[PDB]
């Protein structure tokens, strides 16, 4: 695996709001990745991209509606990172997650 990996599980049913992810990295870096998940024996990916601001921060927002009903697990992945990048937190549905 060449990706930096962050597993998650979700409700199979609730699709309100956003899946919001906080990344911390090199200021002004450029970055991309996905929210990946298994759906009926396929690995599906919702791509994200963005740059860190001058504080090293990048907030990604993906509508929950992009994940099919019935999906209950997946992985946030970092693909390209021009400098350093890590996920610190995500919020999806009622789950407020901090990555120690």
Ligand X SMILES: C[As](C)(=O)[O-]
Residues found near ligand X in the complex (CB under 6 A): 96-98
Least distance in Å: CB of 13 to ligand X?
Answer: 19
Q: Quote the CA–CA distance of 99 and 89 in Å, as a whole number.
A: 6
Least distance in Å: CB of 96 to ligand X?
Answer: 6
Q: Quote the CA–CA distance of 99 and 87 in Å, as a whole number.
A: 7
Least distance in Å: CB of 25 to ligand X?
Answer: 20
As beta bridge partners, residue 48 has 33
Residue closest to ligand X (Cβ): 97
Of 41 and 96, which CB lies nearer to ligand X in the complex structure? 96
Of 45 and 97, which CB lies nearer to ligand X in the complex structure? 97
Least distance in Å: CB of 12 to ligand X?
Answer: 18
As beta bridge partners, residue 93 has none
Of 24 and 32, which CB lies nearer to ligand X in the complex structure? 24
Of 86 and 98, which CB lies nearer to ligand X in the complex structure? 98
CA-based Rg of the chain, rounded to a whole angstrom? 13
Q: Quote the CA–CA distance of 50 and 58 in Å, as a whole number.
A: 7
SS3 for 34? strand
């Amino acid at each position: 695996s060449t990706a930096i990996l962050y597993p998650f599980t979700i409700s199979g049913n609730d699709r309100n709001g956003n899946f919001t992810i906080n990344f911390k990295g090199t200021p002004n870096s450029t970055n991309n990745g996905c929210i990946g998940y298994s759906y009926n024996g396929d690995w599906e990916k919702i791509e994200w991209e963005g740059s860190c601001d001058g504080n090293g921060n990048l907030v990604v927002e993906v509508p929950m509606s992009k994940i099919p009903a019935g999906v209950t697990s997946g992985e946030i992945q970092i693909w390209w990172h021009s400098g350093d990048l890590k996920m610190t937190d995500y919020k999806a549905l009622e789950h407020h997650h901090h990555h120690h």
